[PDB]
Amino acid sequence: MDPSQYASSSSWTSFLKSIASFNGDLSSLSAPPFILSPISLTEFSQYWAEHPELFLEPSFINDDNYKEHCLIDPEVESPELARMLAVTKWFISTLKSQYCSRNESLGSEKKPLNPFLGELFVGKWENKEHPEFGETVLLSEQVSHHPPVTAFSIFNDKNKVKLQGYNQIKASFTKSLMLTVKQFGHTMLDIKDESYLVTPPPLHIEGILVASPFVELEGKSYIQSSTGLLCVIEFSGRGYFSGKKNSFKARIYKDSKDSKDKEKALYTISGQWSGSSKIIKANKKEESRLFYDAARIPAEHLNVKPLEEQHPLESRKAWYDVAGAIKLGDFNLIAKTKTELEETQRELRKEEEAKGISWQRRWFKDFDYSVTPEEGALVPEKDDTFLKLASALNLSTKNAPSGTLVGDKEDRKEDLSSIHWRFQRELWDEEKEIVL
Ligand SMILES: C[C@H](CCCC(C)(C)O)[C@H]1CC[C@H]2[C@@H]3CC=C4C[C@@H](O)CC[C@]4(C)[C@H]3CC[C@]12C
């Protein structure tokens, strides 16, 4: 049907009625074919680096050239600050990819494919037009199905820029049918020997009643550097804190302590992350400059090998039949193909249980950060980067919502684990089957 027919359709009405009985698992809802996306969540990891030049920029800034690598402030105080400004610009640049890509390619936000345990998605940004850049690799793996958890790493060996992280969510519907989403997990970016800890923001899905879903961000995100510098990004939409949707205000401080006083902000950035934003240095409001305009720089999609040469665990290869059925809009075929894949997985889980076998993750391992870890689990190292960055930001190391600070209600929750997924580069180095 035409999108103008979605909202009043029998299918959508049935879907909305099933929300009143939501059990916490989004996959239990009856999503009509018109609201389905043929893209799996394991693919979302690619949204962290669709602007290759911004991802790598920090690695080109040093003590001898930093003032030439800060467009909005050729008088920037230090290379550490120039790099924080670059990391902040990169982070803001990821937002349109992360949260607006389906609206552009599908017409609205839609239900992504729920990845199967073990699902992989790999590719690379060859950066052919920039030999100094080198190849940037993406590795994404579904490390959990119950609940869904995606782990990923994006790395550029040539310039020593590496990123790793994981993601999972908890969702709930309000009585007004707003889908509230809390993200869990964090991402770490290493620029040579300098590190940055990034926490994703909470969000909500609007437009459910009218069958035209879209994401709006809320809350805050943090970017804590090993240099002590901290960027605090606050999100809002429509009105109340801004005159337009997809808005934000970011402030960079010398350290976490200073972030307690907005007046101590070294720079203040404001605007729309899906559009343009300006930056002000100190309190010189009369001298604002353009910081980033998402509309001027088209996203660069990574190179993925043809389906013909993909391993059975690779996302597009595995979901091929379902994706085809979704594109055809065939109700019965979508049900048939999806059930075939998911039933096969259920059978595997039951077999492993009967034989006393467990599923082994491929390139990531869960590290128990709790004081009393499981006797067989892996434990963090001495100079763990996450621990030092979390300490500097006074961030909870428990499995609380992303960005939870020590002492917050979520951090004071009883019997809360502290297990975090970490990339094991050695496992990729010794990979014997998967290629790019
Ligand atoms: C599961 C729901 C859709 C449910 C639709 C329904 C209720 C009709 O089935 C989707 C919609 C928006 C999706 C998020 C979009 C962006 C991101 C950022 C990425 O880095 C991690 C995944 C995440 C949080 C998506 C999760 C799934 C979401 C909420």
Domain ranges of the chain: 1-31, 32-118, 119-309, 310-436
From the list 265, 183, 176, the residue with the least C-alpha distance to 220 is 183
CB 127 within 8 A of CB 226: no
**Distance of CA 240 to CAs 91, 109, 243, 245, 343, Å?**
24, 24, 8, 11, 47
Which atom of ligand 1 sits closest to the CA of residue 181?
A: 29
| Any ligand 1 atom below 6 A from CB of 208 | no
> Does ligand 1 lie within 6 Å of residue 169's CB atom?
yes
Q: Fold for domain 1-31?
A: 6.10.250
Strands (E), 174-282: 179-184, 187-191, 194-199, 203-206, 214-217, 220-225, 230-236, 247-253, 267-272, 276-281
CA distance 22 to 138: 35
Q: How far apart are CA 186 and CA 431, in angstroms?
A: 25
Q: How far is the CA of 242 from the centre of ligand 1 (A)?
A: 24
* Structure tokens, 139: 């590795």
Residue numbers belonging to the annotated binding site for ergosterol: 98
Taking the centre of ligand 1 as the mean of its atom positions, its distance from the CA of residue 112, in whole angstroms, is: 7
List Cβ neighbours of 294 (8 Å cut-off, separation of 6 or more). Answer: 93, 95, 96, 272, 273, 274, 275, 276
Q: With contact defined as beta carbons under 8 Å apart, do 247 and 235 qualify?
A: yes
With contact defined as beta carbons under 8 Å apart, do 225 and 194 qualify?
yes
Residues 6+ apart with CB under 8 A from 67: 74, 75, 76, 82
Ligand 1, pocket-test mutation among 18, 22, 26, most atoms within 8 A of CB: 26
Nearest protein Cα to ligand 1, atom 1:
111
Residue nearest (by alpha carbon) to ligand 1 atom 10: 111
Q: How far is CA 251 from CA 79, 141, 248, 262, in A?
A: 18, 33, 10, 8
For residue 146, what are its two tokens? Answer: 């119950």
For atom 8 of ligand 1, the residue with the nearest CA is: 111
Asked if residue 39 lies in contact with residue 112, where contact means CB atoms within 8 angstroms, the answer is yes
Amino acid at 68: E
What 3-state DSSP class applies to 338?
Answer: helix
Integer Cα distance of 324 and 38 in angstroms: 8
What span, in angstroms and rounded, lies between the C-alpha atoms of 218 and 233?
Answer: 10
Alpha carbons 337 and 304: distance in angstroms, whole number: 23
> Binding site residues, as ranges?
26-31, 98, 102, 111-114, 145-146, 338, 342, 346
**Which of 12, 93, 96, 203 for a ligand 1 pocket mutation test, highest count of atoms within 8 Å of Cβ?**
203
User: Domain 32-118's class?
Assistant: mainly alpha
What residues does 113 pair with on adjacent strands?
A: 40
Residue type, 46: Q
CB contact at 8 A, 55 and 109: no
Query: What is the spatial distance between Cα 280 and Cα 265, in angstroms, rounded to a whole number?
Result: 10
Q: Are strands 36-40 and 111-113 parallel, antiparallel or unpaired?
A: parallel
- Verify whether ligand 1 is closer than 6 Å to residue 177 (CB atom): no
What would the two tokens of residue 170 be? Answer: 């908890």
C-alpha of 75 from chain center: 33
CA distances from 30 to 18, 112, 413 (A): 7, 13, 33
Give the strand pairing for 267-272 and 148-156: unpaired
CA distances 383 to 33, 287, 324, 386, Å, are 49, 42, 48, 9
Helices (H), ranges, 7-49? 10-17
Task: Please tell me if the CB atom of residue 191 comes closer than 6 angstroms to any atom of ligand 1.
Answer: no
**Ligand 1, atom 17: nearest CA belongs to which residue?**
98
Cβ-based burial of 251 (10 A; exposed 0-12, middle 13-18, buried ≥19): buried
For residues 388, 394, 398 and 400, what is the CA-based torsion angle, rounded to 10 degrees?
A: -140
Buried b (16+ CB within 10 A) or exposed e, 416-428: eebebbbbbeeeb
106: alpha, beta or left? (left if phi > 0; alpha if psi -120 to 50): alpha
- Pick from 44, 50, 122: nearest CA to 305: 122
Q: Which of 166, 174, 180, 215 to mutate to test the pocket of ligand 1 (most atoms within 8 A of CB)?
A: 215
d(C-alpha 148, C-alpha 114), whole Å = 7
Residue whose CA is closest, atom 18 of ligand 1?
98
Q: In testing the pocket of ligand 1, which one of 36, 37, 39, 41 has its CB within 8 Å of the most ligand atoms? A: 41
How many Cβ atoms sit within 10 Å of the Cβ of residue 129?
9
The CATH class of 119-309 is: mainly beta
Number of other residues whose CB lies within 10 A of the CB of residue 373: 16
Start-to-end CA distance of the chain, whole Å, equals 39
Q: Coil, strand or helix: which one is 118?
A: coil
Is the CB of 61 within 6 Å of ligand 1?
Answer: no
d(Cα 245, Cα 253) in Å, to the nearest integer? 26
Resolution (A): 1.5
CA distance 182 to 95: 16
Architecture, CATH, for domain 310-436: 2-Layer Sandwich (3.30)
CA distance 392 to 386: 10
Residues 161 and 52 sit within 8 Å (Cβ to Cβ): no
Write the residue with the smallest CA distance to atom 6 of ligand 1. 111
Q: How far is the CA of 27 from the centre of ligand 1 (A)?
A: 12
Any atom of ligand 1 within 6 Å of the Cβ of 44: yes
